[PDB]
């Protein structure tokens, strides 16, 4: 239109979220750019995967022949470390036994994201640097940031970075997406990941308790293409989980001998018993259901985040209240 924009650096100066219903592909980035300099001295773009980051770096690349400014993004450890294969968990990635944990290297930032991230694989393995803490610590310093929906608003992904959100303005764009938040997480336990535990095992205790635990759940999982709540599920000590935990460092111990590290099946099981909830059968597998989609999106309410909502089919206001719990005064500006 022209300067709704004194209305959104306002919104933001008056602690309102501000949701704003904007037809798509048109020069957003510049615009959420230019309101953050009278807000927040950085920026940080919230997006549903890392391809989101390929379309803003193209906008930006515009911007910096006017401007000078520093973009960067996290991908996580499973796709940047040098040692990494597909399957592999985050926590799998065993930097603790790792010599390049503490060496980075600088990164710059005019390749593209995919581009970027392939040289630094290849420059890591030759001079010895770790392409994860490189492109973590280029986020840390970047004018601009971009993260994945896990890392913003899953509490497993968001222990793994440090940042003080209350220096960002956060622009969230297809913001109609985080209606599928709460289907970012799988809390449940199988037959067939415990028997891989069992073969990827290296103690004859860990297997003893595995083969049990493998035992206790076929007693209270249902072979029901539904959902049936369970008593009585599956107990572990904490000797046992002990035994277990000692198994899942010895596991990752020996995979950075290797060039390689892989899926290791007991981290998902180890991970299932840190939550105990109600616990369900579906189709011969345990599962704890995900909670609603505004306990993931509550952070939202704090006064202390400036944040931009856009989309172009965002959501109706009573639709955003009571669905998604937003409950902080809101600015809804349908453009
Ligand atoms: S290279 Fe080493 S330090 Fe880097 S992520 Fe992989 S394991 Fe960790």
Redesign the pocket.
């Known amino acids: 239109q022209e300067k709704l924009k004194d209305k959104v650096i306002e919104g933001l100066r008056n602690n309102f979220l501000v949701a704003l219903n904007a037809p798509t592909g048109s020069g957003k980035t510049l615009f959420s750019l230019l309101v953050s300099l009278e807000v927040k001295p950085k920026v940080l773009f919230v997006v549903r995967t890392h391809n989101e980051f390929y379309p803003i770096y193209r906008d930006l690349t515009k911007i910096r022949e006017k401007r000078n400014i520093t973009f960067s993004f996290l991908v996580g450890?499973p796709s940047?470390?040098?040692?990494?294969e597909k399957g592999a968990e985050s926590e799998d990635?065993?930097?603790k036994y790792?010599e390049?944990?503490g060496s980075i290297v600088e990164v710059k930032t005019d390749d593209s994201p995919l581009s970027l991230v392939k040289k630094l694989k290849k420059d890591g393995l030759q001079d010895k640097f770790?392409?994860?803490?490189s492109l973590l610590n280029s986020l840390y310093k970047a004018d601009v940031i971009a993260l994945t929906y896990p890392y913003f608003f899953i509490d497993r992904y968001r222990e793994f970075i440090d940042i003080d959100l209350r220096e960002y303005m956060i622009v969230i764009d297809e913001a109609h997406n985080l209606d599928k938040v709460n289907e970012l997480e799988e809390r449940s336990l199988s037959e067939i990941t415990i028997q891989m535990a069992i073969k990827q095992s290296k103690s004859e205790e860990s297997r003893r308790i595995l083969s049990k635990l493998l035992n206790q759940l076929r007693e209270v999982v249902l072979p029901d293409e539904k959902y049936i709540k369970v008593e009585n599920v599956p107990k572990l000590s904490k000797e046992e989980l002990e035994i277990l935990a000692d198994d899942y460092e010895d596991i990752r111990k020996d995979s950075?001998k290797q060039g390689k590290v892989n899926k290791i099946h007991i981290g998902s099981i180890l991970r299932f018993f840190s939550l105990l909830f109600i616990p369900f059968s579906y189709s011969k597998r345990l599962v704890i259901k995900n909670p609603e989609i505004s306990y993931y999106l509550n952070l939202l309410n704090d006064n202390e985040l400036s944040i931009i909502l856009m989309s172009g089919t965002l959501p109706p206001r009573e639709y955003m209240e009571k669905v998604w719990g937003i409950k902080r005064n809101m600015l809804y500006l349908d453009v």
């Open positions: 450890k940047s470390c040098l040692y990494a990635i065993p930097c790792c390049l944990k770790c392409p994860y803490y950075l």
